[PDB]
């Protein structure tokens, strides 16, 4: 509570005054990679444990893709108190991404806009980085701290499906789950991989490559979607996910929309918008996808989570797990313990025995 206020009121506003957002992001990854973090003194209650995607999750609060793009800070993120870590997006070949500046703060909106453009060390570098800690990760996973890997595609690739297939082959064996991110707003054409006969063809190839891995090295496969889909796109995705036995959905990526009421000077920058203005658009997308999949497809809920109330709203809408990113940039590492403490308190107040009991509760009212 002391360092929650110190981080929110003094340290983060001081860092944002001294460093542009991408510099601050880079420094945050370096500090995290060295374990230079405040005490994550919140101890996970049994109430927070979730069993989904073939794994135990000690707590349902994960770090979303895009913070640790290149798998440099995984151990530091568990030390921060995340129940699970997602690295990436990782592209087959190394690529630089967009020219700088490409990350923009909207302080008045508690939002960020980014157009990183899948800056990636590439699969080989990330493969060797995860191999160096593979057994340490096996023990973390067994102790309820799973690892996800988010797979992207290179800007100049002539075959999107083959880029994802390469990622399944190279990083699948090192991951508890993989994510096919057909929802970055910052690679031309990527989101059109969300339409039907082509999405079926893409996901069929990804699942075949996954099913070709040895049993102990066989990850869950999730599809990560945009909040910007049409009703037709969402019904098509739900249909294909059920038909192919996709293991879960991540709902949602950043929005290319600009909700009415943004105040930030940088609101008209090109890129994906994250944080508070995405929150309820994300929650509503979770609700719709949970209904279209009859509650049979696990959802990881993400977009504008900054409190236990935000986490519980996504859980009651249909999420089994949640992720956050943008809240960490505003409030720093103490926001993780804050979300967990508030979520545990709210579950008790609303008469839930644990997270599991709350999943999709709004659909049963
Ligand atoms: C700076 C930045 C970089 C991101 N890069 C990625 C990415 O590489 N892959 C991805 O799937 N999502 C990426 N995202 C999206 C987040 O994973 C998340 O879906 C989105 O930001 C909503 O969560 P939030 O409001 O808690 O930040 C990125 C988000 C931000 C803010
Ligand atoms: C600056 N910052 N992230 C910044 C950041 C990251 C991504 C995008 C934008 C920004 C931004 O500045 O607008 C963090 N710092 C930590 C952190 C990590 C370890 C120890 C102490 C801290 Cl405060 C986590 S995220
Ligand atoms: O630009 C990126 O790398 C990136 C940004 C974002 O918001 N989402 C994503 O999937 N990729």
Residue numbers in the entry: 32 to 396
Article, verbatim:
DHODH is a rate-limiting enzyme catalyzing the fourth step in pyrimidine de novo synthesis. It catalyzes the dehydrogenation of dihydroorotate (DHO) to orotic acid (ORO) to finally generate Uridine (U) and Cytosine (C) to supply nucleotide resources in a cell. To identify potent and low-toxicity DHODH inhibitors (DHODHi), we previously conducted a hierarchal structure-based virtual screening against ~280,000 compounds library towards the ubiquinone-binding site of DHODH. Thus, by targeting DHODH, the single key enzyme in viral genome replication and immune-regulation, a dual-action of DHODH can be realized in fighting against a broad spectrum of viruses and the corresponding pathogenic-inflammation in severe infections.
We finally obtained two highly potent DHODHi S312 and S416 with IC50 of 29.2 nmol/L and 7.5 nmol/L through structural optimization, which are >10-folds potent than the FDA approved DHODHi Teriflunomide (IC50 of 307.1 nmol/L). By virtual screening, we identified two molecules with the same novel scaffold, which is obviously different from those of Leflunomide/Teriflunomide or Brequinar. The X-ray crystal structure of DHODH in complex with S416 further verified the binding mode of S416 at the ubiquinone-binding site of DHODH that is similar to S312. Compared to S312, the addition of the methyl group of S416 can perfectly occupy the small hydrophobic subsite formed by residues Met43, Leu46, and Gln47 on DHODH to form favorable Van der Waals interactions, contributing to the enhanced binding affinity of S416. The binding free energies for S312 and S416 were −45.06 kJ/mol and −46.74 kJ/mol, and the binding equilibrium dissociation constants (KD) were 20.3 and 1.69 nmol/L, respectively. Additionally, the two inhibitors exhibited a clear trait of fast-associating (kon) and slow-dissociating (koff) inhibition, providing themselves as ideal drug candidates with a high level of target occupancy. The extremely high SI of S416 may be due to its high binding affinity and favorable occupation of the ubiquinone-binding site of DHODH with faster-associating characteristics (kon = 1.76 × 106 mol−1·s−1) and slower dissociating binding characteristic (koff = 2.97 × 10−3 s−1), which will reduce the possibility of off-target in vivo. Moreover, S312 and 416 displayed almost no kinase inhibitory activities at the concentration of 1 μmol/L when profiled against a panel of >180 kinases, suggesting that S312 and S416 particular inhibited DHODH rather than other enzymes. The results in all further confirmed that compounds S312 and S416 inhibit viral genome replication via targeting DHODH and interrupting the fourth step in de novo pyrimidine synthesis. Notably, S416 is reported to be the most potent inhibitor so far with an EC50 of 17 nmol/L and an SI value of 10,505.88 in infected cells.
